[PDB]
Amino acid sequence: SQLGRREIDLTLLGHTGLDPWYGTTSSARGAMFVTHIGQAPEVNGNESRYFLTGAELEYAKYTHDVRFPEDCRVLHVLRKYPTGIGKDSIRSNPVTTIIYENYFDKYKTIGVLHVPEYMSHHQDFGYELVKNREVWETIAPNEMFSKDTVIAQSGAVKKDGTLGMGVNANVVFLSAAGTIEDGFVANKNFLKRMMPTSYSTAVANAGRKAFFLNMYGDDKIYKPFPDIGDVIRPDGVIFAIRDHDDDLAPAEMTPRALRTLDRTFDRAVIGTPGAKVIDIDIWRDERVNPSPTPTGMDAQLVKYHTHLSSYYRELLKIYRGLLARRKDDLHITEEFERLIVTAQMFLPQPDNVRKLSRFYRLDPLDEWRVEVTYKAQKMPAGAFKMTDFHGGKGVICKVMEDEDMPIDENGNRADLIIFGGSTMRRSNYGRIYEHGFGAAARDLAQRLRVEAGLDRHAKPTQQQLNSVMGNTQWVDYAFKELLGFYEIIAPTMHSKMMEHPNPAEHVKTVLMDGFPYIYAPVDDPVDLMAAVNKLINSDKYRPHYGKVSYRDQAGKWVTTKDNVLMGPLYMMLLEKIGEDWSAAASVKTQPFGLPSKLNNADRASTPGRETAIRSFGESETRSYNCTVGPGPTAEILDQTNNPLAHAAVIESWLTAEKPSSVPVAVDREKIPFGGSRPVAMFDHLLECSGIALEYAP
Amino acid sequence: MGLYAKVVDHNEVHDQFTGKRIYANDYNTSNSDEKEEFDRHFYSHFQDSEAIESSVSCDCRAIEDAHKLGVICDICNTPVVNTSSRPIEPSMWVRTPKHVRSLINPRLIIMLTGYLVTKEFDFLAYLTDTSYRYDVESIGSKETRRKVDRLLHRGFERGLNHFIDNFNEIFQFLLDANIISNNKSEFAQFVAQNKDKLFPKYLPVPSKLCFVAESTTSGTYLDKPIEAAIDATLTFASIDASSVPLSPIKAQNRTMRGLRLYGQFYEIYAKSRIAQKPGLARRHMFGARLNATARAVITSISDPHDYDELHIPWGVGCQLLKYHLTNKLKAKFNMTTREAFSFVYENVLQYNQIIADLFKELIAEAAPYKGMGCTFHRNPTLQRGSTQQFFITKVKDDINDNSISMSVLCLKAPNADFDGDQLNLTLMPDVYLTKATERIAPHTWVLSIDEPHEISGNLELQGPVVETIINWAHEKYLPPLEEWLK
Amino acid sequence: LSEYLATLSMFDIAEVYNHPKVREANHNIEPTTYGIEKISYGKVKEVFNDPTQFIGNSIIEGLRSGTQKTEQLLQAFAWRGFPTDINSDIFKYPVTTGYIDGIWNLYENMIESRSGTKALLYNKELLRVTEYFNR
Amino acid sequence: PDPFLIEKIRENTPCMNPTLANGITVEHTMTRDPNTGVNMTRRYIDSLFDISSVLFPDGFKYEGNRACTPLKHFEEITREYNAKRIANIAPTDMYMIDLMFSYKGEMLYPRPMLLPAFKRGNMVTINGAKYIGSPVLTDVGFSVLNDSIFIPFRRTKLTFKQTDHHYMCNGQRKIMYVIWSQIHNEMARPHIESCLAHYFFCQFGVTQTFKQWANVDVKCNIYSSATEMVLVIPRHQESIFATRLIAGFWYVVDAFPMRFTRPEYVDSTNLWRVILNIDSHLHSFCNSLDEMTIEELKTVGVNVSTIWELLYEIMTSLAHHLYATDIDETSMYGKRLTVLHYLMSEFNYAVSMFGYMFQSRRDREWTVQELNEGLKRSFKLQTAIKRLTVDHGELDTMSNPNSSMLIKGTSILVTQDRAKTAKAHNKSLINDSSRIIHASIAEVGQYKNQPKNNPDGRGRLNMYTKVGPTGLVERREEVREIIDNAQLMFRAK
Amino acid sequence: SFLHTSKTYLKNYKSPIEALPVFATMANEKISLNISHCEILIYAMMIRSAQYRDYRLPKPGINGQFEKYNRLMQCRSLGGAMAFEKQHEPLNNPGSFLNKMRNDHPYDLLVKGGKLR
DNA sequence: TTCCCAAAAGCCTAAAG
DNA sequence: CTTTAGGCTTTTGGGAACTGTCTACAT
RNA sequence: AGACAG
């Protein structure tokens, strides 16, 4: 009934073409899958999918990197913060600027190219840029380069042609209690393999308003913020700027007071602790005769500002030389023009022209502006969302040790545990196919590792593979087995491997990798369930469908009574990983007493958000007024709305032998009802109109 | 017994103020000093987009100290009160000019605007002030034209003093023929019962907090409705800020103009800053932005536990139980409160044994409960189980766990699934509030609200547990009964 | 019950799929509402509801106890039936293939995609109106 | 992976479109000609000025534009402006040009302006924020909507709708469609709507209109009102266009006729203008056709050269699209992927308003001072950029946690209604015949890729789409075969 | 439309006894709703002596007509009217100033700061 | 933007001095 | 015969999900 | 008011 025929191409569906078995999942699951592709950060440990389609090649080809746009000759190479040993030495160089000339043109346009250590586009996620060794070593003035040459490419792009989006996990479909509702059960090692890299920027302004404190230096050396390549304190705190007051000099300017941070009355920017600092950008208004910062606390600031000033001065000098050489023939790239203008905005103006009043989006700038950009590696242990490259999305609800995870008789250790029945409801069956097929393929490879005198779960050394390749008979037999398995799974791949020049290389690659990577195209003439039946009803190629033993929550080492199959699913991490939790015992208040939202500077100043959550909306207050008498609900809203009631609540917390189980929070006799600010405002506004709502007599 | 509206006699409010009474009539304006004083009384100013530091201050921004409480500032003759707890009282007052009998109640103006004021003709304006221009032949309607003709034939004087003094006869004529045409009985009874309260001598100009001006780069942001109010007050100023004193007719006209501006302001403000979906009544009067509240992704415990058991994590526990930890630190260790806050904030992103012990001892000292009582909310709030009480039992020692171990059983009461959803948590600060919330505890949604004698389907066991029970119970581990006997 | 767990893999799907009556119920079907959603689905329900055919299978053991609603398993093993567009109209030509086998054509994939789009819209805007009426 | 396996996978895989993968906005905005080094934006500006040059007072020649030196770029960004040399410190990826005009061979003050300077991957940085610039899927010459022919001009956004009307012929009642179009924006006895034949009769005489646009004569077969005047037409010289004119005439006459006393005044013009006297509006409507609209209509298959020819074509040839349309609103073939016309909407509006308010003042001698004042008040620094982040819906905020621009960055399309985004609307997208299933999605757009923006397939862009020069969506032949069949099934009854 | 040429609006019915079964069948066609809930909703819809502008719940429950949603919301208790749309309409209403017996609503205690009396 | 639904306008028809 | 009341049809205007995050903003 | 999360 044309069950094995697919009248489709990879062309008619782009992102859905990232996976095979797309037609075995419901459309909602597929749309969610594409959305999760869009929302996935980049993992440090990236691996190619076990099942390959032709889309991944194109997606790897079109990615973000540092490309020479045209055939150009490199004219100059510049580097911020010169690296070496000295007084004002810098540990690491963040950014390298390449000034190049697009020759083979009448104009010979001069352009700029930036090579940083990272590239970030999402608000809090990014990825390190790995530099091409064969190209980065050759980067020098007066060199030749081709068009579309790649530097500082993402780590997700492999050395061969493939893009790494997720991690292959030996998933097991057990209906364990850990996977209740929609969740995953994970181990420490697999989560170590999935650590997102987060790049963040902290901005602090210190001028006449406030001055930096001392948080990274001893009494002798004053350090407001970590250097380049330094590590944030165990309590992630930077800047901690304190308001400048002369009359409080012997109180808040002593060496102990500068090191000591008062959580209230001071302004700190609190990032992830232990996060290595990538780089620092310094902006200084140098044309103020009285320097607001008192002498002594401007060492690192002046250091980094001097390095940046030298960098931008060298850029400006290069532009001036080019202009003096080719006036009216200096057609330049727009990026180079903007870079020169930024350098001019950075460098001080001559004394014959009024100084620059620098702003940042209507926000005035005073003296010192510091932008510290730092990277961290998030360790997933809970509230981290994951997807299986299908519609299945879940949250890590249990993290166990490597030993505690399910292990087969072959020794395969499970990386994830998923509730199988969800597939029966969400109707995303392609996963299972992948799962199932992956297991077979994996076992096939392991079978060869047992028949070649090798060990499973251990990458063989080159000597062992050379010894195995010594005899042609077993190599050809293994290649024939691989051909048979491909014929069962992918007839297209079967033909491709039939037209193979060196089968010994293929067998060696399969043994080294430990898994035969399978090309399963979108237009693959396969009857999926027929292939499943063939794998099941075969002496070879059959996955080890045996008992599996794990450790339950009670600590016992228990073996599952029914046969369980372990198979590789290609997992992926998502955004909304958490870190947005907002616990706030007490929230800062507007002049009209009510909690408010958090502005950027005041929201990046607390470890974790300190937002006042609107947990009492109209629907919530409806449910409270109905389930409970309106009295207690009005009391809660009065404690929140009236600042005096909230102050009384906090006083009751602080002035009790047992802060928990306070008999009465607010003594209503001392603080009567009716003091809530919104209600008082409403009543006063009505009274200004001549009316007032009152109870019927 | 209900809740009805009652007309307020502005004279009684004026007499009960007994403080610093300053009137808006005596602002001649047109000069720097009086304009600045008027801007100080009106126009609550925010000079820059920056957080203020004066917790307690006077009307002027000169007494920034807070220990000076109740001290009358010599500059403003106004006592110093908390900025957040500042009493909401009318900022100014307006009295009748020297040639005006009295002032019309703004509620009466708004009530009469619905009927008297029409697109083709303004009946109240024609009846009250003299400088009103109209063309009878320009009335494009028929009912309005007939009403205008009847009013013209009746022939009332068009003075404010005449309207106030003979308000009974004018109002009866308005009732009689067609002018209002509806709600005649209620409106007539309202006028007859509250006649004395509809013409107050003094009229309050609302509080400084009502009117907000935020100066910043690119100007000074204001609101739209405030504008109307401003005009009204300015109008009364122009009554006394005249080089040539106005004739009584002109004074009546300006007074009516100001009163109409007040009525329009109150109508627009009630329609916009209260009635709209974001506002005062529907946004703050019925709950907004609680304190002692957290919000986090719900990751749970699949372990033998209690249904009324919750596990708040390290960061949420430290920030939410900030003052509990401060109290414990101060009580046990000789630590100042500043050192207590420093320790707590320093150890939010890091683990230590001391704060964990303090959490354990807090939860233990919550004696007749499993832990610290709290409420847990899932949005949108549809059912009884969307909001449910839980008891905090343990902060998690793992700093990387920003998770909330709500019970597995209580999952189905809301639509809570572990797919990456953040739920809200409110800490109950009292035993009375915990006892009150006991009515929102999960055991309240066991019995189905739509079936007489049936437990609600929200108590059904989850997927994995049911499948485990199936694979255990429904197995052929024994021969059939006949073979077992034989 | 730390060892009496439930497990899902390709073997269970093959065990349900390879049943001869299911295979018959997925072949020789007139593409009509009566010939699909009353005859073939009836045969598949008769296969599932038999208390003797499938024993020890996680999928059907869960199905017999309400863990899985019958509709999803029917749309998987049997033919998917007449998806809907954004407006609630039924396409004349049904879907020949379920979810266990692959829906590899273009027409069927597009119409099931439109069913998913209908799901999203009927979630969003109908919630918008329904919550106001509830309030 | 086996390198040979990857090689065979590459061989057995169709490549995407480098035009669309690297950024179609990049190609349509920041691509330089090889003969002369000039961006696409600069050429678009020159085209707009050359189109608007018809409205110059014989000597105000537009010389062109140059690329400003970064020295001048910084000097012009940071001006004195009341003793505060204000500078905005931000990346703000931009580049400055200067528009230069000439007057009788002497230069004026050049007017500098800023331009977005798109990067690879449709990426811009504006005021320190990273934005993604998506193309807008636009109809080439005109759209056909639920019951309407929607035609956009440089100024107006006109819509041609239709209704039914009755007229008596030979004593028997007959029904004909009257095509109307509201053009007086201030417009928003039975209430009727401005018919196109009403505009014909308002401009030309009724007999003049009939003689000029048809081989039909008029008296004052027999045509008469339903529920006085009599229009007699030769028994053999009849046409659908003449019948439509008759129907529109009776539609405009049957409800009004208190101003019709002597029927001969119907042959005049002032009477019809009174029935509709904004002669400025009439003249703007007459001279409300420009070169781009004419070129697009020629591309579609219409031969408009004057707006009255356009009205004749709509009344006679394009009216077929109003009742039974061969093309469908549901499809997406034969559509453009416009970028510049929406990015430079502010600049286009500024140039149009400058030209109109400059011609409308006087036709006398122009002084250099007045020309400089007009240029200063018209072409400011941020004329085309002040509204990029607020008024344009094609510029979105980038929140991609990936190294790949394909998945979220470069594969976003925006519909026109979502492209403006100043409306802040919600059509509910369900009771819309526009959002029906069509096979075009499979070739243009991505079904099963269903964001909440457009839950159907039109939200995103199919990355293998064949797009030729000037951003016209071409149709790949081979898959087209299969696609055709699918479409039939989508309309199975 | 039911709750709030011939249609089946609730206000068109004379007594709630003959009005309950229609709503019961209409709901039970697609949602399985208990009769008690339907009775409570209809009884909430009711009004006693609508001519005399009395909007409180009838007793024992039959001696009383029906009323539309907006009039009941804006003419029963101003505290409950504040949480619904168009607060200026009952604020600017003569009837709201008349000392008439009225029903109690929980929002009353929220309309004021919490003062019981 | 478009559908819901109530409240005021407006209109023909009818009854009392 | 003249002058208003009564009820039906038009027109107009307020209103249209909850919580959280982020984004935009001088010339 | 646009996107995202539920």
Ligand SMILES: [Zn+2]
């Ligand atoms: Zn003072």
